[PDB]
């Protein structure tokens, strides 16, 4: 099946603008959050910080990444996420 | 002769999928040669280590029949071959 899918990505991909997130003008974009703590490695009474480890997932939605032909869910090199919008989500307090 | 079958090969290849990309999962052996362990601190409560870490996989994207003998390629073709996502979940 090979040579079909990486046509279904390269045309997911084709005219694809980063710049935009989903339904630029639109509404927007819901954002689902999932943390699965690994461990908290450190608490400093000193620099009154600790460090922690997570598993931080992100959930959307964007239409231009939609497929109908291929019955499965695609997982791609993770080198694919710098040619996708991602939300900019950092951490306030860090 | 062997710029263009290894060109040829990478003509096309798609780094984003695996091996059998729809199809059976890949099986990846793994090797590793322990070079040293460099420090254990109770303090931190971890320690520091150091390996050669190999993996062997099957990519048919990248058979080549012509030529009798293993190819060493520069380090730099990674960048554009697919290569498994092994992490180490503890470090
Ligand atoms: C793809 O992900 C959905 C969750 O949105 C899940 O219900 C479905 O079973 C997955 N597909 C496969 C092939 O497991
Ligand atoms: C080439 O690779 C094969 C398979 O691992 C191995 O048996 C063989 O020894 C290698 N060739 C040389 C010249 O060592």
Same mark, same amino acid.
């Given at each position: 099946?090979?040579? @079909? &899918?990486?046509?279904? *990505? ?7 603008? $980063?710049?935009?997130? /989903?339904? @630029?003008?639109? /509404? /927007? ?10 461990? $908290?490695?450190?608490?400093?009474? &000193?620099?009154? +910080? ?6 931080? %997932?992100?959930?959307? #939605?964007?239409? #231009?990444?939609?497929?109908?032909? $291929? ?7 993770? #080198? &694919?996420? +710098? %040619?996708?919008? *991602? /939300? ?7």
């Amino acid at each position: 099946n090979m040579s @079909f &899918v990486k046509e279904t *990505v390269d045309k997911l991909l084709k005219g694809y603008d $980063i710049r935009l997130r /989903p339904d @630029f003008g639109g /509404p /927007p974009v819901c954002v689902g959050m999932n943390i699965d703590i690994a461990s $908290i490695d450190m608490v400093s009474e &000193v620099n009154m +910080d600790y460090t922690l480890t997570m598993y931080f %997932q992100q959930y959307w #939605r964007d239409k #231009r990444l939609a497929y109908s032909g $291929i019955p499965l869910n695609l997982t791609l090199d993770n #080198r &694919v996420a +710098d %040619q996708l919008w *991602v /939300p900019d989500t950092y951490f306030l307090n860090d």
